[PDB]
Each structure stands twice: as C-alpha cells, then as structure tokens.
Amino acid sequence: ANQASVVANQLIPISTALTLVMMRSEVVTPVGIPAEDIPRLVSMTVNRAVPLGTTLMPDMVKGYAA
Secondary structure, three states, rough: OOOOOEEEEEEEOOOOOOOHHEEEEEEEOOOEHHHHHHHHOOOOEEOOOOOOEEEHHHHHHHOOOO
C-alpha cells in the first residue's frame, strides 16, 4: 500500500554513479527499490539510462544486492 520507492529525479545517464540529487522518494506501482535504501545507493552505478520519473528497480543498479 504506502510503500515508497526510489524514483529518478532526473535522467540518470548509463555508467554514472548515483548522487543524492538524482533520486526522490514516491509511492509508485509496481513497487521498486525501497526509499530507505537511498543512502546506500549513493555511488552505485546504473546499467541502463534511467529516464525522469522511472522507478529504480533492483536489476538496474550494479552491485545492488539486498
């Protein structure tokens, strides 16, 4: 129900390390990576470009294993 996920606050280019201004928290469906993990995502890279408003799903962040 009120599960918030990490949403791309801007376009995240491929092979670019995540910084805190790149991601917001939002209740979206389907649910993606929990918003609690944003500190943890800082500096991991994405393996595809993530357009603005896309929910970051587990399979897009290299090294993400929760």
